[PDB]
C-alpha cells in the first residue's frame, strides 16, 4: 500500500544518513 | 520511504525496445444486463403480417 508524503527530500536524506 | 526521482534520459536516441507485444488489459468486461423490456410473442397473425 503506497502512501506518499509531502516532506522535504533534503532534510529526510540528511536525517536518515546521520 | 523511497524517493521517486525520474531519471532524465537522453533526448536524442533510438527507442530501447521494439513494438511491445504485451497484453495491456483484460479481455473480460463488466457485462451489464439489458433489462429493457420483456420480450414476448406479438400475435398469432404476426407470422402472416
Amino acid at each position: 500500500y503506497a502512501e506518499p508524503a509531502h516532506i522535504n527530500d533534503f532534510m529526510f536524506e540528511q536525517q536518515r544518513r546521520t | 520511504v523511497i524517493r521517486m526521482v525520474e531519471m532524465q534520459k537522453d533526448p536524442m536516441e533510438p527507442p530501447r525496445f521494439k513494438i511491445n507485444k504485451k497484453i495491456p488489459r483484460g479481455p473480460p468486461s463488466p457485462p451489464a444486463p439489458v433489462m429493457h423490456s420483456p420480450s414476448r410473442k406479438m400475435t398469432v397473425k404476426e407470422q402472416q403480417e
Partner: protein
C-alpha cells in the same frame, strides 16, 4: 548585351517577385527555444572553440 546576363537578370527578378507576391504571411508562431532545451539537459555541455 550579353546573352547570359539577360536571362540571369530575368530569373533573379523572378524569384524577387515570387518570394514577395504570395510569400507574405503575418508569420505567427507559438513555440521557441529548440536547441535551448538540449543545453538544459543532464548530458550536453557548453564550451567554446
Amino acid at each position: 548585351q550579353p546573352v547570359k546576363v539577360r536571362v540571369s537578370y530575368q530569373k533573379l527578378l523572378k524569384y524577387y517577385v515570387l518570394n514577395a507576391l504570395k510569400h507574405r504571411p503575418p508569420k505567427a508562431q507559438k513555440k521557441r527555444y529548440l536547441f535551448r532545451s538540449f543545453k538544459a539537459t543532464k548530458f550536453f555541455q557548453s564550451t567554446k572553440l
